[PDB]
Design an enzyme around this catalytic site. Structure first.
Site, mmCIF file in Angstrom:
data_model
loop_
_atom_site.group_PDB
_atom_site.id
_atom_site.type_symbol
_atom_site.label_atom_id
_atom_site.label_comp_id
_atom_site.label_asym_id
_atom_site.label_seq_id
_atom_site.Cartn_x
_atom_site.Cartn_y
_atom_site.Cartn_z
ATOM 1 N N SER A 70 -11.790 11.216 -4.073
ATOM 2 C CA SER A 70 -11.482 10.886 -2.625
ATOM 3 C C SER A 70 -9.881 10.687 -2.549
ATOM 4 O O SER A 70 -9.204 10.512 -3.930
ATOM 5 C CB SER A 70 -12.048 9.322 -2.148
ATOM 6 N N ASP A 117 -15.770 -4.625 9.190
ATOM 7 C CA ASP A 117 -16.965 -4.092 8.487
ATOM 8 C C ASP A 117 -17.540 -5.183 7.449
ATOM 9 O O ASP A 117 -18.696 -4.822 7.113
ATOM 10 C CB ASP A 117 -16.617 -2.904 7.690
ATOM 11 N N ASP A 145 -6.414 8.289 -0.472
ATOM 12 C CA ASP A 145 -6.199 7.333 0.539
ATOM 13 C C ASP A 145 -4.952 8.107 1.143
ATOM 14 O O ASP A 145 -3.934 8.634 0.711
ATOM 15 C CB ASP A 145 -5.481 6.038 -0.382
ATOM 16 N N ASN A 172 -7.814 9.232 -6.031
ATOM 17 C CA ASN A 172 -8.825 8.302 -6.595
ATOM 18 C C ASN A 172 -9.472 9.003 -7.742
ATOM 19 O O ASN A 172 -9.939 10.136 -7.599
ATOM 20 C CB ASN A 172 -9.570 7.669 -5.684
ATOM 21 N N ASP A 227 -12.620 8.934 -8.291
ATOM 22 C CA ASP A 227 -14.025 9.441 -7.624
ATOM 23 C C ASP A 227 -13.850 10.941 -6.853
ATOM 24 O O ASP A 227 -14.543 11.346 -6.312
ATOM 25 C CB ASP A 227 -14.389 8.550 -6.875
ATOM 26 N N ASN A 286 -9.329 5.229 3.128
ATOM 27 C CA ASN A 286 -10.006 6.146 1.995
ATOM 28 C C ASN A 286 -10.863 7.163 2.820
ATOM 29 O O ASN A 286 -11.728 6.911 3.707
ATOM 30 C CB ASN A 286 -10.534 5.290 0.963
ATOM 31 N N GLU A 309 0.868 -1.151 0.056
ATOM 32 C CA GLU A 309 0.006 0.000 -0.112
ATOM 33 C C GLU A 309 0.886 1.306 -0.091
ATOM 34 O O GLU A 309 0.654 2.376 -0.642
ATOM 35 C CB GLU A 309 -1.019 -0.019 1.217
#
Ligand code: CL
Ligand code: CL
Ligand code: CL
Ligand code: NA
EC number: 3.2.1.17
Length: 129
Positions: A50, A101, A52, A46, A48, A59, A35
């Site tokens: 957003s 989650d 990280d 990203n 969209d 995110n 990562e």
């Protein structure tokens, strides 16, 4: 901060990640390697809109507030800048929420594609834990 492999393994173990939700320590070290290359200051934008953040590339669409991701949530109740600290506490505490989650470590694309189903114990070989 750029961690060493065994230095990060030791910090993750002290913060309770070894076998957290059944994921052995080498899974967490492998995810951080791919990562962020063990760099707490890593960021990536990203498509969209957003971003990280940090050693586990958490995110802003769901997990932290950066002020520039409209319609997003802040489920870890933190500014995203807290994820860039030399102290990994905020990153680990948020990661524990993410892995709980429902999809486990599949939330991390690099874990699914580069760590899952591999000999992850190799990432902690030689460390004095
Ligand atoms: Cl390495
Ligand atoms: Cl730390
Ligand atoms: Cl990948
Ligand atoms: Na957010």
């Amino acid at each position: 901060k750029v961690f060493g492999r065994c230095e990060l393994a030791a910090a993750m173990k002290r913060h309770g990640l070894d076998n957290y939700r059944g994921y052995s320590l080498g899974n967490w070290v492998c995810a951080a390697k791919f990562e962020s290359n063990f760099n707490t200051q890593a960021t990536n934008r990203n498509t969209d809109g957003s971003t990280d953040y940090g050693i586990l590339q958490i995110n802003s669409r769901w997990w932290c507030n950066d002020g520039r991701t409209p319609g997003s949530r802040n489920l870890c109740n933190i500014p995203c800048s807290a994820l860039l600290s030399s102290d990994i506490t905020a990153s680990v505490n948020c990661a524990k929420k993410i892995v709980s989650d429902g999809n486990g470590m599949n939330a991390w694309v690099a874990w699914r594609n580069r760590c899952k189903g591999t000999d992850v114990q190799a990432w902690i070989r030689g460390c004095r834990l």
